[PDB]
């Protein structure tokens, strides 16, 4: 699939906000957006068929060891454009960037009943490494897996 990726900045931020409003249940706060922009190459908008149709947004975090890791905050593709590889293109980009920028780990939280997502991330080498009950993945407490991949 021919996907064109662009960084997120003030000038195209509203594109990401629109995608999130369609894809995710509640308004994301301004620290999500600041963290996404600050994550650099790890946050991308996807363009296909001359339209912005998806995004991946990460936060970068420093561990006490000195090591660095990537947290996937959101990954999503608009419904009419799913199943043709755009979401895989976004995640492959981020995984490649983990290696290039010497990240030790990437991880995210997935609600425990979100079988589609667990299946999706395991295809890319992720594994469940923890279970957190009543985690605030959005605004309500939900049981979640920590889903991670080590480098
Ligand atoms: C914190 C987190 O990031 S949890 C992320 C969960 N996000 C969502 O569920 C949002 C709704 N779904 C989507 O936005 C997209 O379908 C994504 C991001 C899951 C995948 O993007 P796509 O472009 O659809 O994925 P891509 O086409 O690259 O590969 C398809 C894979 O998507 C997975 N998938 C999950 N939901 C769907 C869907 N609704 N339609 C198509 N594929 C889907 C399938 O397992 C498929 O693998 P297969 O066809 O080999 O079984």
Q: Is 72 in the pocket of ligand 1 (CB under 6 A)?
A: yes
Q: Which of 69, 93, 72 is nearest to 3 (CA)?
A: 93
CB distance 20 to ligand 1 below 6 Å:
no
* Cβ-contact 105, 150 below 8 angstroms: yes
User: Rounded to an integer, what distance in angstroms lies between the CA atom of residue 50 and that of residue 103?
Assistant: 32
C-alpha distances (whole Å) from 91 to each of 57, 136, 149 are 10, 23, 12
* 27 DSSP 8-state letter: P
Resolution, in Å, please?
1.8
Could you tell me the two tokens for 114?
A: 């979100």
Ligand 1 pocket member 84 (CB < 6 A): yes
Residue 103's Cβ-count burial label (10 Å; 0-12, 13-18, 19+) is buried
Rounded-to-integer distance, Cα 15 and Cα 31, Å: 17
Protein residue with its CA nearest to atom 33 in ligand 1? 120
| 34 dihedral zone (left: phi>0; alpha: psi -120 to 50; beta) | alpha
Domain boundaries, the chain: 1-151
The bridge status of strand 127-136 relative to strand 141-150 is: antiparallel
Catalytic residues: 71, 109
The approach used to solve this structure was X-ray
């Amino acid at each position: 699939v021919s996907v064109s990726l662009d960084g997120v900045r003030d000038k195209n931020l509203m594109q990401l906000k629109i995608l999130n409003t369609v894809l995710f249940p509640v308004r994301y706060n301004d620290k999500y957006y600041a963290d996404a922009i600050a994550a650099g190459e790890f946050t991308k908008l996807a363009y296909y068929n001359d339209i912005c149709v998806g995004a991946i947004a990460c936060r970068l975090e420093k561990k006490e060891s000195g090591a660095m890791r990537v947290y996937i905050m959101t990954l999503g593709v608009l419904a009419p454009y799913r199943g043709i590889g755009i979401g895989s293109n976004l995640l492959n980009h981020v995984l490649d960037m983990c290696s290039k920028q010497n990240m030790c780990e990437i991880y995210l939280h997935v609600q425990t009943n979100n079988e589609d997502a667990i299946k999706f991330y395991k295809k890319f080498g992720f594994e469940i490494t923890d279970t957190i009950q009543n985690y605030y993945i959005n605004i309500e407490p939900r049981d979640c897996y920590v889903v991670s991949k080590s480098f």
